[PDB]
Structure formats: C-alpha cells, structure tokens
Design a protein around this ligand. Structure first.
Ligand SMILES: *[C@@H]1O[C@H](CO)[C@@H](O[C@@H]2O[C@H](CO)[C@@H](O)[C@H](O)[C@H]2NC(C)=O)[C@H](O)[C@H]1NC(C)=O
Ligand SMILES: *[C@@H]1O[C@H](CO)[C@@H](O[C@@H]2O[C@H](CO)[C@@H](O)[C@H](O)[C@H]2NC(C)=O)[C@H](O)[C@H]1NC(C)=O
Ligand SMILES: *[C@@H]1O[C@H](CO)[C@@H](O)[C@H](O)[C@H]1NC(C)=O
Ligand SMILES: OCCC[C@H](O)CO
Ligand SMILES: [Fe+3]
Ligand SMILES: [Zn+2]
Ligand SMILES: [Zn+2]
Lengths: 6, 335
C-alpha cells in the first residue's frame, strides 16, 4: 500500500 | 541563492512562466514538461524546484517525498478579518454536472452515458467520482462504466479517450496539458457545454466562472447557469446554486509542492513574488498578473486570491486528510 510510482 | 526554477506543464504554461521570469528579474526561471507526472520527476531529480498541484497529484508527489509549501486560497466568508496569506483554506466542492434538458439523467442512471473528466488522477475530475462508482458497482472495471469519455492521461485508443479532441491542429489527442481542448476544469466543462459528453466532473466554481457572462470566451460567452443541473448522491437533481447540499465531496485546495530541502527558499521567494504580481500586487495589472491567464488556469487557478501559509507544517497526508488518502489508496487497488 506504499511506494513512489517512479 | 534563491533563484527558483518553476516547472510548467505544456507550451502555454511555459509561455506564461517565461513572462513571469522576465518580470521577476530571473528570480524565477522555467523548466517545462509535457505532463504533470513528468514535472514531478524533474522536481525529484532537482532539475526543477516546484509547481502547483491538484490534490490527486499531491498524493503522487508526496508518496515520492515531495512536501506541500503554500496553498491556493480563494474568496472567503467566515474568518474575514485575517490576511489572505494567514487564512485557513476551506476546500472546494466536487460536483457532477449535466444539461437540464437531459431530463431523467441522475447519479443512478450514469451507466453507458458519455463522461467528461479534468484528467485521470485529479480530485474532482477522477478520484472522487470513479472511487464512488467502483464502490457502488462492486467492480474495478471503471473503464467499462461509461460508453465513451474524455479523461486526459488515459490510453488514447481506449474508450476513455474517445471524446477528447487534441489541439487546434488535431494533434496531442488526450494529453494531460492545456493543449488538449477538453483538459482541466474548463476543458471538461466545455466538453459538457458543447454536448460532447452527458456529464462533467468538475468543481462548483467552474460552473459559475464560465456562465452568465463571467467568461467571454467563444464557447462560453453565451452559456446560462439555468441550463445546467447538479447530480446529488441521493438520486436527485438540483440547480447549480445548491452545490452545498448536492456535491460528491469536499476537496483539498490545490497547493505548491517542492523538495523538502528547497521548501523554505521556495516559500520565501513566492511570498515576495505574490506581493509584486498577486491579486493586488504592486505590478499587477500594470506589468504581470500571476493569477490570471484568461480563464485557462495556467500555473495557478485564475480564481486564486493568494498562496497561504500552511498550519502545522503538514505532511502530504495531513494536508490531503486521512479519509481522502484512503479513498485514493482504495481506488488504486483497481489498476
Ligand atoms: C460556487 O462557486 C461560486 C463561484 O466561485 C461561488 O460564488 C462566488 O462567491 C463569492 C462570495 O461568496 C461572491 O462574491 C462571488 O461574486 C461569487 N462568484 C460569482 C460569479 O457569483 C459560490 O459561492 C460557490 N458555492 C458554494 C456553495 O460554495
Ligand atoms: C470506498 O470504499 C472504501 C471501503 O469502505 C472506503 O474506505 C473506508 O474509508 C473509511 C473512511 O475513511 C475508513 O474508516 C475505512 O477504514 C476504509 N476502509 C478500508 C477497507 O480501507 C473508501 O473511503 C471508499 N471510497 C470513497 C471515495 O468513498
Ligand atoms: C529578486 O530577488 C531579490 C532578492 O530576493 C530582490 O532584492 C529583488 O527585489 C527581486 N526582484 C524582483 C523584481 O523580483
Ligand atoms: O480535512 C480535515 C482533516 C481530516 C482528515 O481526514 C484527517 O487527516
Ligand atoms: Fe482539483
Ligand atoms: Zn459534504
Ligand atoms: Zn503534523
């Protein structure tokens, strides 16, 4: 449910 | 050492930014990208310092570690004694709008109709209405709900882009920047006005600012508010004067983000820049107006009175609010 999309 | 690099999204924001740069004596300079997501990346790489973002894009930028710096603040009511810069922001109303003559269309009969969205991942244009729909239908298949749509940023050959129109040459169909005719609050409301779509997901202010002579743009100069209705979540339809009892959600104001290591310098430069070019700034309207762009909402919404200081040095989660963040998170389980 969490992480930078780049 | 406070030269601030602004990021402009698409060619029209770039031109406005260049005019700001010139007037600021290069205290602000410009970097440009084709999409908001690309401008976010320039910021993460340190090739740009900042830009103003819708709440859905603040979620993206904040999961990558960018932080809010100052918020757009528009015309108030309560708390009227305070300076704009020190006034608490109050959020805007997300609404679903249809033509009054499209009788018998309600929230409960939207399936298989045509839709108009500001852009994929934006608050009023996408996160709120598609989150509600997926929930209500028990289905992640949000790209098969409407028969056709314009939702900039989606696959250009999908039905989600079928209604978008591209630029006046017809190029850049469905790109998420102002060159797309139906991009943004104003593009999505135009998409409804010209009857390309049955419904438009925008905010309450957009309806008022582009009707009854408030805009003189050709597609809008002749629109009348009485020709529109809001769709309420209980199945009823209301006049656009009732947005307070007929909206989809209250959304967090657009806000400037930057790297945490540049936040302080970005804040100071902006506070001084708006003293020069903001609403009653000392060189606006004479030399440059930072919060005007002929209703096209370039860099900032044209209805911005000032950029306001935030209370409590909030994280992007505290800015957006726990419930909105969770709605976004839930909706993103789908794709
Ligand atoms: C929906 O948006 C409109 C447009 O911003 C709001 O109307 C403005 O409100 C201010 C003060 O309340 C007036 O001084 C302006 O003249 C209004 N604009 C126009 C063009 O009328 C309206 O109040 C909003 N509705 C709700 C319930 O928030
Ligand atoms: C769609 O449904 C989900 C699931 O109910 C909603 O998430 C709940 O949100 C409330 C209010 O924030 C919380 O108390 C619950 O913890 C959430 N549940 C889960 C499983 O995460 C979500 O808000 C809904 N989306 C929208 C836009 O309404
Ligand atoms: C540029 O910034 C400098 C230092 O902050 C300030 O002295 C000057 O007035 C600014 N010029 C303009 C026009 O923004
Ligand atoms: O917008 C008011 C803040 C409430 C939020 O949902 C909790 O962080
Ligand atoms: Fe928005
Ligand atoms: Zn409400
Ligand atoms: Zn905090």
């Amino acid at each position: 449910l969490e992480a930078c999309a780049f | 050492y406070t030269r601030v690099v602004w990021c402009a999204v698409g060619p029209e924001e770039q031109k406005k930014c260049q005019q700001w740069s010139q007037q600021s004596g290069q205290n602000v300079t410009c970097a440009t990208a084709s999409t908001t997501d690309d401008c976010i990346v320039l910021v993460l790489k340190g090739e740009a310092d900042a830009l103003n973002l819708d709440g859905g894009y603040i979620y993206t930028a904040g999961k990558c570690g960018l932080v809010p710096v100052l918020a757009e603040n528009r015309k108030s009511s309560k708390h009227s004694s305070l300076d704009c810069v020190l006034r608490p922001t109050e959020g805007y109303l997300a609404v679903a709008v249809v033509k009054k003559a499209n009788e018998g269309l309600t929230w409960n009969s939207l399936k298989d109709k045509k839709s108009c969205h500001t852009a994929v991942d934006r608050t009023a244009g996408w996160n709120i209405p598609m989150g509600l729909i997926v929930n209500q239908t028990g289905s992640c298949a949000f790209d098969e709900f409407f028969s056709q749509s314009c939702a900039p940023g989606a696959d250009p050959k999908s039905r989600l882009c079928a209604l978008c129109a591209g630029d006046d040459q017809g190029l850049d169909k469905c790109v998420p920047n102002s060159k797309e005719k139906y991009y943004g609050y104003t593009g999505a409301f135009r998409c409804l006005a010209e009857d390309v779509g049955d419904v438009a997901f925008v905010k309450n202010d957009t309806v008022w600012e582009n009707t009854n002579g408030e805009s003189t743009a050709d597609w809008a100069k002749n629109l009348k508010r009485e020709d529109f209705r809001l769709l309420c979540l209980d199945g009823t339809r209301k006049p656009v004067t009732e947005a307070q009892s007929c909206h989809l959600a209250v959304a967090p104001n657009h806000a400037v983000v930057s790297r945490s290591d540049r936040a302080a310098h970005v804040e100071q430069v902006l506070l001084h820049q708006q003293a020069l070019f903001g609403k009653n700034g000392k060189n606006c309207p004479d030399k440059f107006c930072l919060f005007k762009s002929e209703t096209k909402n370039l860099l900032f919404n044209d209805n911005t009175e000032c950029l306001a200081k935030l209370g409590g040095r909030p994280t992007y989660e505290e800015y957006l609010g726990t419930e909105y963040v969770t709605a976004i998170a839930n909706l993103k389980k789908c794709s």
